Structure formats: C-alpha cells, structure tokens
Write an enzyme that holds these catalytic residues in place. Structure first.
Site, PDB file in Angstrom:
ATOM      1  N   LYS A  43     -23.829  -9.093  29.137  1.00  0.00           N
ATOM      2  CA  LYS A  43     -23.722  -7.990  30.084  1.00  0.00           C
ATOM      3  C   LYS A  43     -25.092  -7.487  30.525  1.00  0.00           C
ATOM      4  O   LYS A  43     -25.270  -7.129  31.696  1.00  0.00           O
ATOM      5  CB  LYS A  43     -22.905  -6.851  29.476  1.00  0.00           C
ATOM      6  CG  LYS A  43     -21.466  -7.233  29.164  1.00  0.00           C
ATOM      7  CD  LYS A  43     -20.734  -7.689  30.414  1.00  0.00           C
ATOM      8  CE  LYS A  43     -19.308  -8.109  30.096  1.00  0.00           C
ATOM      9  NZ  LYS A  43     -18.586  -8.586  31.309  1.00  0.00           N
ATOM     10  N   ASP A  52     -36.282 -38.606  61.983  1.00  0.00           N
ATOM     11  CA  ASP A  52     -37.140 -38.259  63.105  1.00  0.00           C
ATOM     12  C   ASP A  52     -37.905 -36.969  62.834  1.00  0.00           C
ATOM     13  O   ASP A  52     -37.509 -36.150  61.998  1.00  0.00           O
ATOM     14  CB  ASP A  52     -36.318 -38.110  64.386  1.00  0.00           C
ATOM     15  CG  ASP A  52     -35.498 -39.344  64.698  1.00  0.00           C
ATOM     16  OD1 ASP A  52     -34.755 -39.329  65.702  1.00  0.00           O
ATOM     17  OD2 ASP A  52     -35.598 -40.334  63.942  1.00  0.00           O
ATOM     18  N   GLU A 106     -12.295   0.777  39.436  1.00  0.00           N
ATOM     19  CA  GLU A 106     -13.726   0.515  39.390  1.00  0.00           C
ATOM     20  C   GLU A 106     -14.328   0.599  40.788  1.00  0.00           C
ATOM     21  O   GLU A 106     -13.663   0.309  41.787  1.00  0.00           O
ATOM     22  CB  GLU A 106     -13.992  -0.861  38.783  1.00  0.00           C
ATOM     23  CG  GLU A 106     -13.428  -1.040  37.383  1.00  0.00           C
ATOM     24  CD  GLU A 106     -13.502  -2.477  36.904  1.00  0.00           C
ATOM     25  OE1 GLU A 106     -14.014  -3.329  37.660  1.00  0.00           O
ATOM     26  OE2 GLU A 106     -13.048  -2.753  35.775  1.00  0.00           O
ATOM     27  N   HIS A 121      -8.451  -4.930  26.808  1.00  0.00           N
ATOM     28  CA  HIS A 121      -9.672  -4.432  27.436  1.00  0.00           C
ATOM     29  C   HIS A 121      -9.423  -3.116  28.167  1.00  0.00           C
ATOM     30  O   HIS A 121     -10.255  -2.199  28.117  1.00  0.00           O
ATOM     31  CB  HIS A 121     -10.226  -5.483  28.400  1.00  0.00           C
ATOM     32  CG  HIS A 121     -11.512  -5.086  29.056  1.00  0.00           C
ATOM     33  ND1 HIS A 121     -11.562  -4.290  30.181  1.00  0.00           N
ATOM     34  CD2 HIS A 121     -12.798  -5.378  28.747  1.00  0.00           C
ATOM     35  CE1 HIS A 121     -12.821  -4.108  30.534  1.00  0.00           C
ATOM     36  NE2 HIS A 121     -13.592  -4.756  29.681  1.00  0.00           N
ATOM     37  N   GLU A 158     -20.681  -0.779  30.639  1.00  0.00           N
ATOM     38  CA  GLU A 158     -19.791  -1.922  30.781  1.00  0.00           C
ATOM     39  C   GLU A 158     -18.966  -2.093  29.514  1.00  0.00           C
ATOM     40  O   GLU A 158     -19.476  -1.928  28.400  1.00  0.00           O
ATOM     41  CB  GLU A 158     -20.578  -3.202  31.071  1.00  0.00           C
ATOM     42  CG  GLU A 158     -19.706  -4.394  31.425  1.00  0.00           C
ATOM     43  CD  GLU A 158     -19.177  -4.334  32.845  1.00  0.00           C
ATOM     44  OE1 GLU A 158     -19.604  -3.442  33.606  1.00  0.00           O
ATOM     45  OE2 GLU A 158     -18.331  -5.182  33.199  1.00  0.00           O
ATOM     46  N   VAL A 159     -17.690  -2.425  29.688  1.00  0.00           N
ATOM     47  CA  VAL A 159     -16.748  -2.562  28.584  1.00  0.00           C
ATOM     48  C   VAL A 159     -16.446  -4.038  28.378  1.00  0.00           C
ATOM     49  O   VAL A 159     -16.012  -4.729  29.308  1.00  0.00           O
ATOM     50  CB  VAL A 159     -15.454  -1.773  28.844  1.00  0.00           C
ATOM     51  CG1 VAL A 159     -14.496  -1.928  27.673  1.00  0.00           C
ATOM     52  CG2 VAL A 159     -15.770  -0.312  29.085  1.00  0.00           C
TER      53      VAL A 159
END
EC number: 2.7.7.48
Length: 1518
Positions: A124, A1044, A54, A36, A110-111
């Site tokens: 995603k 109560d 990131e 990734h 996004e990867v």
C-alpha cells in the site's frame, strides 16, 4: 453483517463437493469483500469522512479547497519516483479507502487485511506514498507561488489486519473491536468451510493453485532465472571536440555532392548515352521475339463457350482447316490433327465431351476431352516438328529509329484494335448511375472485353487439359463459330498451337508461324508455344485484372479531376491494362518497378536519376512491347524533367496531383503476378550479391586486421588514413558520441524506459508466443549430404519440444543454444508462405538471438515514439507533424549575424527536404557496431545484466554459415563453361555447401535497432553542426518511419545582393576558421555532405539512387508513409482476391474472396470499386464450383427455395453488398436467414420456413466443428460442408505423433486451449501437433506447391470432392441429400433452443472495433473465455499466466455475463451457450484499421457515415 448473512444463506443449500471452481472463486471473493468491508465501515464510522462510498484523490483535493485549475495543470505531471511512472492524472482517479480533511491537513488511510501485515503495508505504501508526496510537494510549490492561500499537508497511513484479526486493536484502537473480531473470524471459518468442503475433489488442487496465484504467490514461485554474468564493455574516452576538429578539417576543402541537378537536357543526354552504351555491348538482333501468349481475333460479339456449341464449332472449324494447304511442319501437324478429329467415330464423339463420371474408355479416346494420335498417321513434317520440340542473349536496336517506327506502329495497331467497338440497395442507385453508365456500359462494347472472355475460355480449356492423366494426349477445341481453333500437344510446361482468322485483335503477323490463304479469307497459324501453370492462371484472370485496374484508374481520375473520364480515354486505359495483363514478363515488371522511383527522381530539384536510368538498361530488350513501354517512359520522363500539371502515362489527359501519377504506375506494376518472381535468375543474383559482400568484408579484414574491422577503428586512425570512412567499417568514438547524444534525451524518462524494457516479459515461455509457432520459414538441420533443410518454425518448435523436458523462456533458451553457430539459407520458392518476408531464413538459435535484440531495442525506442520514430496509431504522425511545424515556424523569421559592432547582416531562412532509405537493411552492413552502442546506451535499469545479454547475443550473431541452395548447386553443375565471376563464387564455398559470412545479419529482424542507431547518428550530426557554427542559427530536424527517413535542413541565404556575406565568410577564413570555406555558397550542400559523412562513419550509406532532395514536400508526404502495413495500396488487395484462393471449399473460398474485398475497401477503395470487385470474385468462384445459375450445381435446381434463400455452404450467394459485408460480416447472411426462418415458422407455421430450418439442421449435421483461434479458414456458425483436401506426397514430420482420435478427445476435454496457447511442455506439444493436422494449416503450408496449385485450378463442377455419409460424392448429390432431409424434417424443442441461441484532403489511419470493449473489462476476451472454461490445474495456470491482470478475472467474467444478458439476452451458466457464442465475442474483441479521408473519429458509426458519404464518386451525398 447483512451481506455475510446473505452469503451464508446461499452457502447453506449447497452440499459439500458440488460447487465448481469459478463459483467457489466468486464465493471466496465476496466473502473477502465482506470481511474487508467490515473494517472499512468501522473506520468510516470512527474516523473517515466518507461514510457511503470511496472518493477519488482529485475529488478529495477539491473538497479540501484545492482549486480545480491547479489540479488540471498538475494532471500533466509525471511522478518521478513512481515505479510505473504513473502521471498525476491517473493518480487522481484511483480511490483510497478512507480520507479525512482537517483544515489544511489531508490524511489518507488504506484498509487491507492479510496474513503478512508488513507485506501489505509495504504494498500500500508503494501504491500511495510516492504519488501523495509528489502531490504535497507540488502543492507547496504552488503555495510558494501565491496561488494557494495556505500550504496543504498530506499524510498516508496503512491499517493492515491479520487474517485472524488479533492485531486490529494495535492497528486501530477502538471500543468496537470485539464485534468486528467475532464477525471476521466467523467469515474466516466460513471461508475455510467453502475452501475445504464445497469444491469437488477433482478441482480442489486447481482451487489452491488459484488461491496461490490470485494472491501474491504465497507458496507457488519458481524464479530460477539467474541471468548469467556476461561480460560487458568498458566505455572508452570519446570527446566531441575530436569529432568537431575532424569535421573542421574535412569541411575546409571542396567535397563532391552526391546528387545531380535535374534538367530536361540532362535527362535526355543521359538517356542517349545509355542507349549508345547499350547498343554496342550487346549482340545485335534484327527480329523482335514473340510477346503474345495467345493470338486471336474477333469481329462479332463473343458468346461463352458451351459443350454443345463446342462440338459444332469444332466440326465446322476442321471442315475449314481441311480445305487449306500447309506449307510449314506446324501447319502439317495442324492438318493431321484436324483430319484425325474428323475421322473419329460416333461413340468417340460422345465420350469426348462426356464428363469423367460418365466417361468410358475407347480404342481412340483414352481420356475425356482428348484423343490418341499415333505416329503411324503423322506425316514426315509432323514427326520432324515433334522431334525438334522434344529434343531441345541478344538485344534490339533501341537507338535506331527504324525499330522505333516498327514497334510503335505494331503496338499502336494492337491497342487500336483492342479499343475498337465491336458490332434496391442505396449503393445500387449510385452504381447504376455512375459506374455502370461511365465504366461498364463503355467497356462492354470494346473488342478487348470479348477478347478477354475468349482468353478466359481458352485458358479454361488449357487448364482442363493440364491434368496428370490428360497431358499425355492431344486435344482440339474451337471458339467463336469455328473462327478460333486450339490444338494441344502431349505435354511442367503445356504446349499448344492457335489457328485463327486474320482480323482486328491480338495479331502479330511477324511472329506468326505462317499465314494460309483460301481466297478472301486469311488464316494465321501461330508457332507452337509452351506455357507454365503460373502464367496460365495469370492469363485466366486477365480480363478481371484489367477491369479492376481500369476501375481503380477511374476512381483516381474522379478523385483528381473531380469529374468523369471521357469514353476514348477509358477505352485506351482498358486496352493498356489488358495488354499489360496478357503479357506477363519479368522485364516489364522490373521496368515498372524502376519507374516508381524514376518518377520522383525527375520531379525534384536534385536526385540520383543517372543511376536509375542506367538500371533500365540492365536487361536486353527482346519484344516490341518493351521498346514501346520504354519509349513512352522516356517521353514522360523528359516532359516531367522539362516541367520543373503532370502528364498521364496511359492517355492524353493531364493530372493536377502527383499522387495520381504515382498511382498509375503503382497499378501498372501491381498488374504483374508475383509468381514470375523468384525464378532461377533472381536467386543466383542474391547468392552472388551476398558472396561478393562477404568477400569484400574478408578483403577488408585481410587489409586492416580482424580486430579493427570487428571492434571498429579509432578516430586518430581515421585522421591518418582517411580511407577508413567506408561502408562495413565504423568508428568507436562516433558510436559512443551518438549513444551519448541519444542519452541526452533518454535520461529524462529513465523510469519509463526501465518499465517498458521489463514489460517485455523476458520470463514467459519462448514457444508459447504466436510468433514462435507461426507458419514462417526456418532453417532446419545439416543433413547427411551436407545441405540445410528448409522447414517451418512450428515444425522446429515441435522438434525442440520433443527432445526437451520443459518449455524454456527466452533467456534460458538463449543460454542452452548459445554455443551453436548461426546458420542461414535462401528460402525455397516452393515452400514460401504468406507470412514469409524477405529471402533469407535462419535457424532457431539465430531467431532467438535476433528476438532478444529486437525486443530490447524496441522497448528502448518506444519511449521516443513522439519525437523521431513513428510506430502506429496516435503516435504515427506526431513526429512528422512536429518536425514540419517546427520547420515552418523557424522559416517564418529572419536571421541576423553580427559582423562588427551592432551592424548586422540579414539572412532569409529557406528549407530543403531530403528523403532517404537510410534505415533500410543493406547487405554490406556490420552488426558489431551495435555492440559498442548498446553498451553505452542508457536503459535506466539498476544493473547491466540484460544489457550484457544483449551484447553477448549481438556478438554471437556476428558469424553466420550461409548455405547455397540445391537448385543453384545443380544449375552450376549443369553448364560446361564456368564464368570467371562464377569461379570466385564457387571458391567462396570450400565444401560446396556453406561458407562463413561476417558482419551482415542477412535480413534479420533488426529494423528498430537500425532506426534507433540512425536516430542517434543524426543527433550526433546535429550536435556537431551546432558546435561548428554557433553564430549561425542553422536549423535541422528529421523523422523516421519504417525503413525511410526525412531530413529537413533550414539554411540561410543572403538578402538583397551577395556582398557582405562573402566578405564576412572571407574574414572568418583569414581568422583561422578554414571550415568556413564550405559555408560560402549553398550551405545546405555542405550540411548534407557532413551529415552523409557522419552517417558513413557509422557504416550507414545514404543511397545515391533512391534519395530525393527538393525545396518542397510533394514526393515526401507519400513515399515516407509508403511501406507500412497500413499504407499498402488497395490495388494489390483487389488484384489478390482473384488468385491464391484457399481452395478449402465453396463456402470458405467465397468467404476469403469477400473478406479480401472488404479489406481492400478498408484500405481506401471506393465503395463502387469494391462492389465491382466483389461481383467479379463471386462470379469467378461460382464458375469454378459450378453453382452459378444455369449450370450443373445450381442450388435452385435441387432445392425448394430461391437462390437468395439458400445458405452459403449449400451454394448460396449471400448479401452481395460490400456495405453489409464491411459492417455486419461475412457470415451474418446465414444468421439473418435463420432469424427470418425462425420468425416465420414460430408465428405462421409456414412449410417453406420449416424447409429452410431443415436445411440448416442438415448443414449442422454434416459438420459441427469447434472454433480454434489458429484456424486460417472462415468459421461457420451454423455448420459447413466438408470438402476433399489436397494430400501432399509426404506428410509433414511429427504430424503423426498423436492419432486423430487422441487429438479429438484432447480437444473435447480441453475447451480452454481453444482460445489460449498452453504453457506446459506436454500440452504445448499436443497443441502444436493438433495445429499441424488442421486442414487450413496444411493447405497454407503447401500454398505454392505445384501439385496444390494445379489442384486448385481443376473445376470441381464434376468431381467427387464432397463428404457425405463417410463417402466422397459430388456437390449435387449433397444438394439432393439436403433436399431429401429437409422434406422429412420436424422441429424439436432442443433444435428450437439451439437455433434461437445461434441467432442474436488528408488520409489518416483511425482504428476501430466492431462492438468495442466494456471499460470494466480489463483483460483480453480470450483470457476471460479461458478463465471461464478452465477446470484442470494446468490450464488454469496457463490462463493465469496469460492474463495481464490475473487478480481481476472473476470481475471480468461477471461483467461479460451481465453484458451478454443485456445485449444478447442469454445466460452463461447454462451448458454449451459459450461454446456457441464465444467466437462472436472473440471477433468483436479484434480491432480493424481503416484508411479514412477527413475528420472521422474512431467509432464504428463515424466510419459508417463516412462510407455513406463516400458512396458517390463525384458528388457529396450528405
């Protein structure tokens, strides 16, 4: 690429088939990380602005030019279309892979790389796009407001690459694609090599299962649920206008208020009238009955009785007795027994006091401590007494002042005799300066102290005689130099006689059998009395209970007054406590329970005190003590009613706070044991109540028809009958309108409600939950005789799993058991457990349906926890705080009403508070009213399938078969005269076994459903009241907690004089607004009348007895929170540590007592009181097991170490500091001792340290058991001593399904199942069978069995109950063996390593953790441990299902490894290290709740500093 080279290099050295499952998991995970990261870094180099790491969405927005204040304001907003309903604050923290900012354009990419490109893109998009679009819309909205100079545009993209990377050029066109493809296909080849070759073949399958479940269920899914298509209900047309018109018609007349004004004269008149009524409806008596179980007197200091002193005392006492002249048959028996005792032989005398191991049978002495008394040497009077003994209601004149004088004088004389005087750690300083000086040193000189010790000795002797082989013989004992003599007859109930010298003390001359005179000495001989085991145990710890109660009263007095009580007050309090403790009667317990509600009923403006006063006269008054207590209560109640500074019940002091007065009576009530409850008087009462309510329901069905009673009545029927507004009946329109009103607030959080409902896990297996395999009671199956068995839910689970091929889920189990009729019965008192709540037990299908309904309604109601219902933690106070703050803010104002033109009438705003037990279950309720409720309630789900299932379950719990107990059957068959009300009760049951009950759910767990229904009805009342008087700014709020509820009514009152207000009310009346007749005066009364009528329309009846109304909140800030599992008073916990001990052995009994004391400390007990309780409990335990100094099993007598250096299992005592027990723990003393021994031996080669090490090694050799999370005992880290355990007559069913050897092997080869519950059928069966054979489970299941109760009482001082070399020997033999082993012991490297491993104001409810949890650790600690230990595919599947985040488990394991190496300094990869240190992490995972007074936070250090501050009772020590 460097990381890929690293991974390949450390893959090269491992031969195929050698890497474990977890190691392969980590290899695959970091290979996936590298593959990734290649694409992520390439996109970073090509287009992304974050080249190193990131960045969070919030930081990206800040970089793009978004001001920080706008982001902070938006953090409070919730995304509407987000599937989980995530707020923007949480959305900002998560980090997209790549981001770029170009002017006002923010582009996110996004990867992800996966085989299914579309699925990854969709995932995603679901993760990012909704929140990003909401952020963009909010930014545009702010730009329109001028707070942002230019609008921002946010776009989201997904780059999803195939596993082979063939689409990387289409997803992202770049010139560097070829190298990336080569690298990632090399990574894929290495991944295949790791998956196919490096794992062992036996683990291979598990790996692919992991690989299937660590991903998005690639080829492993079942989804067979198919929720059935159950029919629902069609919403009828309900209009709020009809209810408004009905209320207008109802309020146009005069309605009777349900409560009475509180005045002293009214209370006095009610008391007098009740006394007059009672004294004429009962058979009158002139002789009070006996109330003292033991009668004795003391004139000198009392020394503890010893065997040597007992013989001399008995000799001199019998010498005294033989010189007396009997005049009654009991006295003749006493003389005969004394003569027999004197005429015993020398060997008889020796064997009489000899222990059982040294005992020898003799023609006259058959058992130790007893002797034989034949009928030949008994006299005629003795024979007559025996014959009358073995061949076996009225009230006193409480109205007459003569009985008043007699009883008051007698009790006052007894109390005066009792109170008559007879002839270091940082905690230690404060203790010896405050508690020792003002409590111990004062009460130590009291007569009651020595009387209590004498009572303890007497009860110890009585218990010693209570054995099975000893109860058939007579016994004689003496005390206080022959001044007290005790005779035991051949007793189940044990019978005895007490002969004492007349003097100050526990003397009741009018109830004594006779008084003998021998000159100037008077000997009182009492009647022969029978006592059972429970009362005997209560009597044994009478002194300890009295001392604990006195200490609690001392602490409360110091908290209230701020100084210390005087001597006489504390002496009187101790005398009262001792007198209450020694007299264990049901009438006193009921009286003190009623007082807890009588006190608030007289200190408020309105209440239902006549009914509570009447309840005091429900039972006859027999003894003088009851009359004295009742009269004291009468005086106190009259004074309290006249006072509207609070008088004290026990002494002449006056309290400044009402909570102290409540605490006094709370301690008084808790002084009485729970063993006297549940007798064969309270079971028949419940049976009759249930039968009566069922018969009333049947009568209503016969009157109005079954359909009307079940489905509810229509509004127009109510408008024409007006009798239909009664309990057990409900109006459909009322239910629907309440549902609509609740939907008005529930519609703003539909997504949250849906998520909460779906998070209840309706698919996970039913029997894999701790609540379905607990120790709670359950109804079994209809036996051959026709009765219903009383079993345990674990046994029923095992029975079901035996005949079932799988472990069904909740909905599936409901499907299979849908056609079975619900059954219920009353729990047997001999089979009750600690986890049992209530008196009714049902079958398995009933519990399944109730669980379905409870889960659904709790999921719905959790989303309004901030507004009306308080659960716990942060949201436990928000509802009440909001209600009170809104009420106060509204009251801080004025009202103006327009009569005509601009002229206004001024109104002053006032508040009144009502506390009622509206939520509490009532036997006369109707469950079917929920069917129309949940049908109309809005849950936000896209379908009605689950709603229809809940409706069907509610329909199936409508009819129940109630079974009567065998004991009640026998009792009813016993008496010859049947009462008319008994005849109807029998006619209810047609076959003599069971009867049909409709409507009532019989205490089923539906608390949250009832609370939600009550909240809906209250909202309906608020809406209709708002519609009735739009011009009046009336105020109404409410809150609910457990059973109560508190209602605040803010009404208006006329300013100055009442002239214009009545004129306007009249003008409205002639205008046609007849409902304005009620608003004339006391508008709050009409408010409550309408509210109560509307609640009754939903079959909720406000209790006219326990409901309290007042203009202020003094009784309402305590009772409202009273009832929760966290607000329980510490008095019960303190008093419960002296009884109900597990009896599992010395070490764990001491551990249980100390843990109970620590828990009581956590509930708000003062440190000094907790220390005193610890000392008392340990003294009792050491006395029971004989390990106290100077006694037989003292460790110092057989060991070469001091008493403080002995391990707890070997008779050691431990830290003896409540502060050290609360912080470190119960078993940390052993670890500290082991650390000291290790440090001494490894640095000085000291012989004694080696001896200590040898002792620890011997303890480890004796028993080294693995920790199981289902064990109820205390786990010992350094081994334990095995003790003999109670053996029931018949073993539980299915306990012999598997042999002990098979279970041992299964436990050995399945370490994961020591921390998680198995999911598969076979594994769950084996797990449950193993749990059923656990000694701590068997002991807990037979907690109240009479045989076990007697076995716990027997003194283990001289019994072979210790396991050693596969043989049963006494404790001192084990100590001698330990000493011999420790003498000839040498340290070894393996033992060295193992030892080193084994050592390493306002009251709020802050919850803390011992060592907290790492923020990185997302899943539960047991889940991570099971992950680590998992090898088999089945156990790994169980772990994966159990974990909340199955994807993130290796990360948590690595984090825990790093944390262990940091703080403990150990390595997990070595064998057996986790098998040793995992229980430490498990205990650290658990969280504990502490009641703290102040601004203390949730961290452990803060509560430690708070306890340091509270170390002193009177002065701050900061």
């Amino acid at each position: 690429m460097d990381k890929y080279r690293e991974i390949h290099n450390k893959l090269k050295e491992f031969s195929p088939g050698t890497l474990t499952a977890v190691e392969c998991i980590d290899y695959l995970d970091r290979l996936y990380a590298v593959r990734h990261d290649i694409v992520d870094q390439m996109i970073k180099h090509d287009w992304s602005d974050n080249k190193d790491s990131e960045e969070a969405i919030g930081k990206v927005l800040l970089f793009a030019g978004v001001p920080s204040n706008i982001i902070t304001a938006l953090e409070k907003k919730i995304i509407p279309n987000h599937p989980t309903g995530k707020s923007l604050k949480a959305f900002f923290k998560m980090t997209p892979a790549n981001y770029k900012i170009s002017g006002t354009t923010i582009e996110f990419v996004e990867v992800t790389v996966t085989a299914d490109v579309d699925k990854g893109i969709r995932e995603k998009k679901l993760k990012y796009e909704a929140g990003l679009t909401y952020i963009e819309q909010e930014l545009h909205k702010f730009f329109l407001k001028g707070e942002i100079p230019q609008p921002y545009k946010i776009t989201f993209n997904v780059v999803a690459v195939r596993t082979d990377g063939s689409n990387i050029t289409t997803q992202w066109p770049s010139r560097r694609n070829d190298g990336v493809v080569q690298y990632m296909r090399l990574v894929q080849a290495e991944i295949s090599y790791v998956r196919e070759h490096l794992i062992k073949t036996e683990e291979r399958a598990a790996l692919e299962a992991m690989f299937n479940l660590k991903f998005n269920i690639s080829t492993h899914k079942s989804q067979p649920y198919y929720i059935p298509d159950y029919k629902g209900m069609e919403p009828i047309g309900a209009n709020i206008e009809d209810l408004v018109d009905y209320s207008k018609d109802w309020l146009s007349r005069a309605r009777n208020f349900s409560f009475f004004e509180v005045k002293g004269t009214a209370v006095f008149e009610c008391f007098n009238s009740n006394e007059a009524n009672h004294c004429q409806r009962y058979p009158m008596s002139r002789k009070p009955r006996n109330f003292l179980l033991i009668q004795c007197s003391l004139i000198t200091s009392y020394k503890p009785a010893t065997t040597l002193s007992d013989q001399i005392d008995s000799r001199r006492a019998c010498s005294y007795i033989l010189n007396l002249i009997p005049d009654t048959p009991a006295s003749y028996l006493i003389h005969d027994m004394a003569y027999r005792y004197i005429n015993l032989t020398r060997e008889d005398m020796i064997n009489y006091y000899a222990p059982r191991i040294q005992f020898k049978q003799t023609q006259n002495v058959r058992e130790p401590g007893t002797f034989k008394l034949t009928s030949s040497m008994l006299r005629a009077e003795s024979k007559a007494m025996l014959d009358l003994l073995n061949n076996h209601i009225e009230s006193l004149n409480i109205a007459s002042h003569i009985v008043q004088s007699e009883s008051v004088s007698l009790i006052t004389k007894i109390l005066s005799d009792l109170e008559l005087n007879i002839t270091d750690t940082v905690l230690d300083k404060f203790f010896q300066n405050e508690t020792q000086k003002y409590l111990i040193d004062v009460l130590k000189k009291t007569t009651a102290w020595h009387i209590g010790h004498l009572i303890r000795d007497i009860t110890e002797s009585l218990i010693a005689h209570s054995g099975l082989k000893r109860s058939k013989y007579w016994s004689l004992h003496s005390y206080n130099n022959g001044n007290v003599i005790l005779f035991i007859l051949p007793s189940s109930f044990i019978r005895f006689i007490t002969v004492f010298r007349i003097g100050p003390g526990l003397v009741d001359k009018d109830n004594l059998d006779t008084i003998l005179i021998d000159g100037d000495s008077q000997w009182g001989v009492s009647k022969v009395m029978s006592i059972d085991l429970n009362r005997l145990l209560a009597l044994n710890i009478a002194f300890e209970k009295a001392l604990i109660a006195t200490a609690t009263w001392f602490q409360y007095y110091t908290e209230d007054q701020g100084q210390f009580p005087l001597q006489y007050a504390i002496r009187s309090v101790f005398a009262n406590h001792f007198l209450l403790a020694i007299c264990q009667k049901m009438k006193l317990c009921a009286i003190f329970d009623n007082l807890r509600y009588l006190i608030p009923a007289v200190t408020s403006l309105y209440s239902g005190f006549p009914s509570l006063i009447e309840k005091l006269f429900e039972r006859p008054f027999k003894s003088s003590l009851e009359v004295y207590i009742y009269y004291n209560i009468k005086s106190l109640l009259v004074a309290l009613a006249q006072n509207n500074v609070y008088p004290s019940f026990m002494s002449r002091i006056v309290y400044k706070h009402y909570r102290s007065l409540i605490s006094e009576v709370t301690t008084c009530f808790f002084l009485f044991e729970k063993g006297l409850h549940g007798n064969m008087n309270e079971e028949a009462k419940i049976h009759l109540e249930t039968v009566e309510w069922a018969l009333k329901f049947r009568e209503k069905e016969e009157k109005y028809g079954e359909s009307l009673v079940e489905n509810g009545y229509m509004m127009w029927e109510l408008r024409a009958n007006a009798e239909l507004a009664e309990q057990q009946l409900y109006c459909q329109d009322a239910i629907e309108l309440a549902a609509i009103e609740l939907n008005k607030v529930l519609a703003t959080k539909s997504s949250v409600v849906a998520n909460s409902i779906l998070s209840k896990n309706w698919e996970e297996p039913y029997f894999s939950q701790t609540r379905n395999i607990s120790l709670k009671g359950m109804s079994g199956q209809v036996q051959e005789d026709g009765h219903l068995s009383s079993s345990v839910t674990i046994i029923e689970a095992i029975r079901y799993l035996s005949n079932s091929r799988h472990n069904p889920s909740l909905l599936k189990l409901y499907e299979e058991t849908r056609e079975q009729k619900a059954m219920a019965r009353i729990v047997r008192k001999y089979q009750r457990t600690e986890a049992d709540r209530g008196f009714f037990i049902t079958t398995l299908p009933t519990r399944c349906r109730l669980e379905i309904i409870e889960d659904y309604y709790d999921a719905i109601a959790k989303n309004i926890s901030e507004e009306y219902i308080s659960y716990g933690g942060e949201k436990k106070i928000l509802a009440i705080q909001g209600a009170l703050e809104k009420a106060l803010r509204w009251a801080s104002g004025e009202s103006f009403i327009e009569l005509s033109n601009h002229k206004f009438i001024r109104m002053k705003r006032k508040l009144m508070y009502v506390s009622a037990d509206a939520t509490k279950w009532s036997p006369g309720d109707n469950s079917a009213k929920f069917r129309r409720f949940t049908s109309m309630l809005h849950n936000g789900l896209p379908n009605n399938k689950l709603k229809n299932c809940v409706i069907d379950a509610l329909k199936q719990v409508y009819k129940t078969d109630f079974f009567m107990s065998r004991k009640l059957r026998n009792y009813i068959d016993s008496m010859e005269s049947l009462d008319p009300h008994i005849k109807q009760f029998l006619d209810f049951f047609p076959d003599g076994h069971h009867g049909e009950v409709k409507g009532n759910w019989l205490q089923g767990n539906l608390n949250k459903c009832s609370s939600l229904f009550g909240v809906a009805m209250s909202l309906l009342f608020k809406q209709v009241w708002t519609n009735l008087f739009p011009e009046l700014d009336c105020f109404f709020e409410f809150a609910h907690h457990s059973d109560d509820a508190l209602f605040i009514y803010g009404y208006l009152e006329p300013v100055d004089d009442g002239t214009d207000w009545f004129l306007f009310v009249s003008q409205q009346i002639q205008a046609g607004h007849l409902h304005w007749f009620s608003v004339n005066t006391e508008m709050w009364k009409s408010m409550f009348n309408l509210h109560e009528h509307i609640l009754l329309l939903g079959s909720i009846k406000i209790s006219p007895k326990k409901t309290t109304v007042s203009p202020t909140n003094a009784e309402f800030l305590s009772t409202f929170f009273e009832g929760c599992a966290v607000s329980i008073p510490f008095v019960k916990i303190l008093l419960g540590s002296l009884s109900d001990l597990p009896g599992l052995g010395y070490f764990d009994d001491l551990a249980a007592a100390q843990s109970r004391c620590v828990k009581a400390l956590d509930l708000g007990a003062s440190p000094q009181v907790a220390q005193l309780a610890v000392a008392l409990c340990t003294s009792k335990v050491e006395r029971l097991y004989g390990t106290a100094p100077g006694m037989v099993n003292h460790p110092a007598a057989y060991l070469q170490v001091k008493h403080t250096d002995t391990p707890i299992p070997l008779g050691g005592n431990g830290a003896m500091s409540i502060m050290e027990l609360a912080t470190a723990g119960i078993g940390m003393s052993d670890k500290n001792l082991l650390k000291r021994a290790l440090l001494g031996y490894s640095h000085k080669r000291q012989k004694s340290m080696l001896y200590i090490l040898g002792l620890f090694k011997f303890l480890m050799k004796l028993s080294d058991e693995t920790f199981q999370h289902e064990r109820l005992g205390q786990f010992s880290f350094i081994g334990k001593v095995q003790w003999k355990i109670f053996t029931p007559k018949s073993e539980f069913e299915f306990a012999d399904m598997y042999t002990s050897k098979f279970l041992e092997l299964w436990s050995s080869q399945h370490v994961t199942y020591d921390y998680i519950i198995p999911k598969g059928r076979d594994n769950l069966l084996i797990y449950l069978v193993r749990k059923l054979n656990d000694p701590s489970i068997v002991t807990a299941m037979t907690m109240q069995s009479p045989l076990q109760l007697r076995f716990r009482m027997q003194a283990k001082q001289h019994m072979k109950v210790c396991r050693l070399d596969g043989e049963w020997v006494t404790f001192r033999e084990v100590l001698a063996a330990a000493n011999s082993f420790a003498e000839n012991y040498s340290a070894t490297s393996q033992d060295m390593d193992l030892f080193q491993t084994l050592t390493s104001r306002a009251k709020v409810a802050r919850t803390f953790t011992v060592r907290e949890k790492d923020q990185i650790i997302q899943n539960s600690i047991p889940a991570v441990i099971g992950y680590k230990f998992a090898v088999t595919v089945e156990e790994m599947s169980d772990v994966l299902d159990t974990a909340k985040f199955p994807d993130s488990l290796s990360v948590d394991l690595k984090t825990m490894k790093d944390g262990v190496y940091r703080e403990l300094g150990l390595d997990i990869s070595l064998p057996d290290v986790m098998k040793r240190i995992a229980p430490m992490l498990y205990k650290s995972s658990k969280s504990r709740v502490v009641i703290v007074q102040g601004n203390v936070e949730g961290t452990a250090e803060a509560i430690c500093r708070y306890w340091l501050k509270s170390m002193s009772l009177v002065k701050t020590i900061r």
